[PDB]
RNA sequence: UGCGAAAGCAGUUGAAGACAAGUGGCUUGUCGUUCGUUAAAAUGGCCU
């Protein structure tokens, strides 16, 4: 009756390349810059910069 | 980003006999006054109501002292023999004094010239006189007649009640603090009798056998009372007629007691006890009447008191000695046009919808070593350690912060003879203590590692190294003999 | 600095309006003033804590 | 994180950022946010990055 | 009707500004609160009211940008080393400007500020500047969103007041001029859409103790333009 | 006093149109009464002394007719933001009331004239005036389908009017003050209420006899009736709402209010209700949260108690808790 | 320690640099005024440059460089610049 | 965890668990006022 | 580096190629080069 799942997130996982200095931050702001779209190694998190919560 | 963490002062493991909160509070009773009386101070009472004056009964006079100047404001000298007891009424309006001729005389307080009435009690000396603590118009006087009397101060011709029954020398009364019909009296045969006054009154309802002749009986709760006499004091539950604590922490006989409640203190209650050998001690009724602080005086202490529960000002502990003197230890406590121009600066947002607050709190001022460690001036931080007016734990904590944080060597690089002598001259003093000596060891080791040539050149730190050598020789003899004592009681397990 | 010290000077003519403020205008000790961008409307704040409000009927 | 005023060569600092700055950049149209990647290298057994933008006005960590 | 008659002020009303578009009046004084009133004829009611503790305010201004005319900031400041900026959203998100980016010695109090518009002049991108009047002759101009110190203009004497003039150049380009007066009466005009460099220096005829300069007849900081072609 | 000068619901109570002053000029805005289905753009009256004297929702491009004070009925679509068509009479007299039945708009004038316009043709059909009706400030079309016979006009004294003969066919004893609400309840009754009194009276439109008197406990500002006469909710001068439940039954000649609703904040400040709307089992009340911005609330009015006190959350002394900072700063 | 550049006509400051830590005793320039060198009691020699075409068309000196060469002070500084000597 | 589940930590730190008219007017107004 | 206990106990430190300097070679030293082995320094320091 036991089942395995992965339920909680992981590391943010930026560009793990050499030979790229500066822009290794792949997270984006919106154009109506109210929510901040960051990838993770398990998902895309979309936080909201007004309330600091993850909204999607 | 955060704020910068403060430099934490190095605290070691605590040593035995630390400063308890009770003894910190009772140790700030200082600035002792010694007033030489004509004879032994036998009794001392406090005004209850504006609890700010106290009456001291010496021989053949009673002096009311003030609790803000500690001089005699008023004095009562028209007694014929030795006045024995002097207490204030519960309203603090008048003052009763029992006298060696068995003449209770009650004046009004703060007017020594109007003797209000002179109860002629027994022909024997009257040794204790106190008003009721609930009732106002009854006064209890016990005398060397082995009988106490309750007097209505309206009808001061015959006593309204005559509490007999004790075999020898009744020296103390007390009233029970919720039941006003209940008088506990104490005599020199032991045997705290206590009487219900609605009954006959010639027989106690029960008797508590303190084995020694009692000197005082006070009431702490409405239930428990404390009797002192002999080398101990005992406490008695009164609803169950039964003893439950006894402390015998004195050498000679406990002469007096009194008790404090609800006053501004870590101790919520306090019983202090005065004991004919010099000592007055304070016992805490909430942890099993354990002693918390004490004073030693210059002779046998005959009576003591403290300021009452609602003192609201300069607070006093007074002890009168059998030597004939009185010891007081106290703890103390632009234009209308311009204002109309600068009106609003005291408003603080009452009718206002949103109230914003981002004024940061102003923290404690940084010391020079802490701001130099912050500014990464590590040699200047060592220099700021070895100023003279620095605390020993502060020198230790800046040494430890430079040790953990960066480099002893960085802090010691640019030095020479004249700028190392503060460090080594402190290391002489720090090598004695246990808490410093590890840090002193590695700092001295590093400085002789990187200044071994200045050792050769300058002779005036060679002698400092030699003195340090004899210091470590004494300390290593001490740290060896401590291991020998450790083994010689490891043998005794 | 003093009470009721406010004038409205017409310009280009550079001539002070002589009918307002009168001796009974509750201007107070005029410590701020503001003009509306659209309504033609003065706000005058004084040291007592009062913004008084006037409308210029030309606008 | 220092920001150099390139006219007078004048630094403004932000000193205790719980990780070394391995990437920093201005972000807004007017440049009202700074986004930073903080590597947090007290543990050598893992590369654990903190993503921290912050508004450029009072330099407070909006959405770490 | 007296505009703050609905909700009384607990101090002398030190500054006062209307909104550029909405029917709002912002009052503020030394009782360290600032109040917005919906004004009309009859019933001037109180929209909202924010009490900044420990910060008496001396100048308070509605700023509204030229790009989208949708920000609606309120900048407020008194005799403090900071200046608050409330972002109007109808809780309240305010930020605090407290960093002169290397220039704190020449700006010990944020009392006399003015807010204005500035154009990048290589893009057609405008942004608001706040302009702080400092000690020596200094005007410290800094960004109204990021708070970055952009430039500084020093006049020679005791700076007493200043004002902002704008002049159009072409379609969609204008130029910002800072007009700052000595106590003695001599006036500097700085072009500041380029680096803050003087273009004109003249002298007031008469006038020895000079307290206040103002411009008018076009877009001042108190009659602000909502659209860049209306400058 | 309230900043909202005029306000009215659409039928079904889904939107609220409201005229408020904005720094000496009138502005007309529309708000949805429930967001779960801001609206920051207004119609601006460009003159400082032109103002709206009445307004009526038409029923389907949705629009408002705003009766002005210069002899004009502006017709203003709300999805767009322009007056689509400007009806005008031949005069400059302010117009006191309008109404419409279908496509047939009727209006009354300050010179006591009756005008008829056609919304389908944008034309002034009729202009007349009748004797002994000389201070008119309300009209109401008595509905008889697409026939728009029998106007019902008030001047402190209601008069029933046949429009084919242009004459008065009944005369109702009105009030001692000008009538402020005059509304048809059923096909045989109409309610009326005057300025500055707390008494409505329902008249029988076929006989002239007053059926009943309804007694608010404060002076009545607006009223709404549910579409089947079963409930009447009036809103008063002290910002309260009073619901008369089933007023047209046999408290026999004069009926008090059955329910009374007021709104207080969390503080103790009593905000006033202006202009509620009632329907079957559903009641939508309106107030102004900030100075001029309307907030709404739906209520199942049949299951609330009699003396109901709505509680709203409103900022009174709350510490500005910023989301980017903990409570210790 | 501050070094200021003043427009001669209009007699007013263009830009101020906070360069040295103590006094600036002596400062000099080259022929075409693309550089200004400066030195004082804090014993560093600072170089302020305007050599870029954008610097020359914008009249904007930059605090280019800084050298520590002297032991105690610099009380005198001068410059010579010719075809075989600079 | 203390309610009959077992949490585990992956080496790339994913925590896992082993357990047991008016309508168009409304639409166009929410468009045109946003 | 491995086993360990926080003590300690066993193991070390090759090769190729390229480049730089010095005097095509020779010497020395490097490597954002590879294979194998369990294997100190640019006056440059922390915000309001």
From Swiss-Prot, chain B:
Its main location: nucleus. GO terms for molecular function: U3 snoRNA binding. It holds the Pfam family WD40. Gene3D superfamilies: YVTN repeat-like/Quinoprotein amine dehydrogenase. It comes from the Eukaryota. The keyword Cell membrane does not apply. It is found in: Nucleus, Nucleolus. The keyword Protein transport does not apply. GO terms for cellular component: 90S preribosome; nucleolus; nucleoplasm; rDNA heterochromatin; small-subunit processome; t-UTP complex. Keywords: Nucleus, Repeat, Ribonucleoprotein, Ribosome biogenesis, rRNA processing, Transcription, WD repeat. This is U3 small nucleolar RNA-associated protein 15. It comes from Saccharomyces cerevisiae (strain ATCC 204508 / S288c). The lineage of its organism: Eukaryota, Fungi, Dikarya, Ascomycota, Saccharomycotina. The gene is UTP15.
Curated annotation (Swiss-Prot), chain C:
WD repeats lie at residues 25-58. This is U3 small nucleolar RNA-associated protein 18. The chain holds residues 536 to 594 of 594 of the full protein. Belongs to the WD repeat UTP18 family. It is found in: Nucleus, Nucleolus. Interacts with snoRNA U3. Interacts with MPP10, UTP21 and UTP25. Component of the ribosomal small subunit (SSU) processome composed of at least 40 protein subunits and snoRNA U3. Transmembrane segments: none annotated. Present with 9570 molecules/cell in log phase SD medium. Involved in nucleolar processing of pre-18S ribosomal RNA and ribosome assembly.
UniProtKB/Swiss-Prot annotation, chain D:
It is found in: Nucleus, Nucleolus. It comes from the Eukaryota. Coiled coil: none annotated. Involved in nucleolar processing of pre-18S ribosomal RNA. Required for optimal pre-ribosomal RNA transcription by RNA polymerase I together with a subset of U3 proteins required for transcription (t-UTPs). Interacts with snoRNA U3. Interacts with MPP10. Component of the ribosomal small subunit (SSU) processome composed of at least 40 protein subunits and snoRNA U3. In the absence of snoRNA3, forms a complex with other t-UTPs. This complex can associate with pre-18S ribosomal RNAs. Present with 6560 molecules/cell in log phase SD medium. This is NET1-associated nuclear protein 1. The gene is NAN1.
From Swiss-Prot, chain F:
GO terms for cellular component: nucleolus; nucleoplasm; rDNA heterochromatin; small-subunit processome; t-UTP complex. One of its GO terms (biological process) is positive regulation of transcription by RNA polymerase I. WD repeats lie at residues 13-46, 47-86, 174-213, 215-250. The keyword 4Fe-4S does not apply. Involved in nucleolar processing of pre-18S ribosomal RNA. Required for optimal pre-ribosomal RNA transcription by RNA polymerase I together with a subset of U3 proteins required for transcription (t-UTPs). Belongs to the UTP5 family. Interacts with snoRNA U3. Interacts with MPP10. Component of the ribosomal small subunit (SSU) processome composed of at least 40 protein subunits and snoRNA U3. In the absence of snoRNA3, forms a complex with other t-UTPs. This complex can associate with pre-18S ribosomal RNAs. Present with 33100 molecules/cell in log phase SD medium. This is U3 small nucleolar RNA-associated protein 5. It comes from Saccharomyces cerevisiae (strain ATCC 204508 / S288c). The gene is UTP5. The chain holds residues 2 to 347 of 643 of the full protein.
